[PDB]
Amino acid sequence: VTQTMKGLDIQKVAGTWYSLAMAASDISLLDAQSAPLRVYVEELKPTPEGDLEILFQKWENGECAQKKIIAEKTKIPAVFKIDALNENKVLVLDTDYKKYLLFCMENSLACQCLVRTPEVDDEALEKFDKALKALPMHIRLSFNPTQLEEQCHI
Amino acid sequence: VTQTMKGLDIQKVAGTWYSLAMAASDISLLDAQSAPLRVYVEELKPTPEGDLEILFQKWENGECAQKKIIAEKTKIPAVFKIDALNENKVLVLDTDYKKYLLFCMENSLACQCLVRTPEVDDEALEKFDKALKALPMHIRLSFNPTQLEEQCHI
Numbered sequence: 001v002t003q004t005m006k007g008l009d010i011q012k013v014a015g016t017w018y019s020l021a022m023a024a025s026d027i028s029l030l031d032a033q034s035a036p037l038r039v040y041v042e043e044l045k046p047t048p049e050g051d052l053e054i055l056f057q058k059w060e061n062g063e064c065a066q067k068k069i070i071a072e073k074t075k076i077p078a079v080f081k082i083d084a085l086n087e088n089k090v091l092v093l094d095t096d097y098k099k100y101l102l103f104c105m106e107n108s109l110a111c112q113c114l115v116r117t118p119e120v121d122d123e124a125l126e127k128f129d130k131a132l133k134a135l136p137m138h139i140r141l142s143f144n145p146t147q148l149e150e151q152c153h154i
Numbered sequence: 155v156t157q158t159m160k161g162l163d164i165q166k167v168a169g170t171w172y173s174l175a176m177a178a179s180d181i182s183l184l185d186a187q188s189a190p191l192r193v194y195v196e197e198l199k200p201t202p203e204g205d206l207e208i209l210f211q212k213w214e215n216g217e218c219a220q221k222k223i224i225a226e227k228t229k230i231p232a233v234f235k236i237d238a239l240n241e242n243k244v245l246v247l248d249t250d251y252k253k254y255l256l257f258c259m260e261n262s263l264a265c266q267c268l269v270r271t272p273e274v275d276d277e278a279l280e281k282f283d284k285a286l287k288a289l290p291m292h293i294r295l296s297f298n299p300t301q302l303e304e305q306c307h308i
């Protein structure tokens with residue numbers, strides 16, 4: 001991935017978001033309620049040091065678990081690191097802070113269209129599909145306003 | 155769905171096809187290996203009477219089953235009926251006979267991009283995405299050339 005947000009201000013992504021849409025390189029990354037990159041974002045909390053804590057839900061062991069991860073900053077403002085068995089990158093592609101944010105997680109790849117409200121944002125989906133045009137995605141999911149107001153988008 | 159192939163010649167769709175891509179109105183229609191509209195097309199056999207027998211595979215009870223369905227003609231050449239508990243329609247959106255065919259099954263909705271060979275047809279995917287632009291799809295899957303040569307696209 002070689003789309004990053006030039007000039008990103010990480011403090012301005014703070015707050016409420018909805019996972020409107022998701023996509024991944026491999027079907028198995030999103031196909032089941034319990035698939036590993038089926039993660040629903042709740043809230044971003046930038047630290048004063050400029051790390052980004054992520055609140056999200058994950059369907060786990062037949063139910064909707066509350067989860068909390070922190071992505072550590074790098075020399076590149078639009079690029080964060082999650083420590084695990086593998087070195088995994090979080091990239092911010094594009095945001096306008098007040099309506100949408102596009103990002104990817106990569107080691108292979110999953111991306112999302114975040115929005116501030118439980119509404120279908122045709123414009124934000126256009127920009128998302130445009131950004132995926134380049135990437136080798138084999139599954140795409142989108143959610144309706146009813147699902148967006150439910151735990152794990154049921 | 156109000157995209158049908160004007161002038162369709164049902165005899166000319168006979169033969170080998172690959173389910174390159176699928177999409178559906180509802181995630182649950184395609185999400186699992188065993189989801190009900192995860193059906194992989196093998197072969198179309200038009201009858202002399204102008205019905206269309208469909209050979210396909212379905213992941214069933216932990217394995218890849220061989221299946222055979224016949225879709226009955228209507229007064230509209232691009233529209234067929236499958237008899238079940240519900241009245242279910244098969245619509246041919248568009249074909250060039252020698253490379254691609256787009257169709258939908260509807261009662262709510264699932265569509266596919268068929269191709270004659272195990273190759274990624276960028277052009278045929280463009281026409282497919284164009285045809286879905288209108289429809290309310292919430293899941294899309296595509297398959298690579300390796301998967302296309304395997305039973306149930308493993």
Ligand SMILES: CCCCNc1ccc(C(=O)OCCN(C)C)cc1
Binds near residue numbers: 041054069084101
């Ligand atoms: C704009 C930044 C959004 C980042 N959001 C998320 C990033 C990662 C995860 C997440 O669940 O991490 C997956 C685990 N690692 C080891 C692959 C969940 C949400």
Ligand SMILES: CCCCNc1ccc(C(=O)OCCN(C)C)cc1
Binds near residue numbers: 210
């Ligand atoms: C160009 C025509 C292609 C039609 N292909 C297919 C049509 C239907 C099916 C199929 O599996 O039918 C689903 C069962 N009914 C009752 C909803 C599988 C393949």
